[PDB]
Amino acid sequence: GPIYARVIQKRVPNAYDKTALALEVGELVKVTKINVSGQWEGECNGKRGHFPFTHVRLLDQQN
């Protein structure tokens, strides 16, 4: 299940940033690779990469 994570604090890192999500405060990253800790791999409508739970507020993965 991919969650929708309302990212409340992110930078603009391309897939060249060891493949990171280029997204921003207030945006939405749909994590297609989930975990328990919050260090998952995210996909934001065309951006693929990985980031932590530290600065995201996410809706569920069953939705």
Swiss-Prot record:
Protein family membership: Belongs to the CRK family.
UniProt function note: Involved in cell branching and adhesion mediated by BCAR1-CRK-RAPGEF1 signaling and activation of RAP1.
Protein name per its UniProtKB record: Adapter molecule crk
Domain SH3 per the UniProt entry, residue ranges: 1-61
Site (Proline switch) residue list: 2
PTM section of the record: This leads finally to the down-regulation of the Crk signaling pathway. Isoform Crk-II: Phosphorylated by KIT.
Gene from which the chain derives: Crk
The record's note on its domains: The C-terminal SH3 domain function as a negative modulator for transformation and the N-terminal SH3 domain appears to function as a positive regulator for transformation.
Modified residues (Phosphotyrosine): 4
Subcellular location: Cytoplasm; Cell membrane
Tissue and organ distribution: Ubiquitous.
Subunit structure as annotated in this protein's UniProt entry: Component of a complex comprised of SH2D3C, BCAR1/CAS, and CRK. Within the complex, interacts with SH2D3C (via C-terminus), and BCAR1/CAS. Found in a complex with ABL1, ABL2, CRK and UNC119; leading to the inhibition of CRK phosphorylation by ABL kinases. Interacts with ABL1, C3G, DOCK3, DOCK5, MAP4K1, MAPK8 and SOS via its first SH3 domain. Interacts (via SH2 domain) with BCAR1, CBL, CBLB, PXN, IRS4 and GAB1 upon stimulus-induced tyrosine phosphorylation. Interacts (via SH2 domain) with several tyrosine-phosphorylated growth factor receptors such as EGFR and INSR.
Portion held of the full protein: 236 to 298 of 304
Transmembrane segments: none
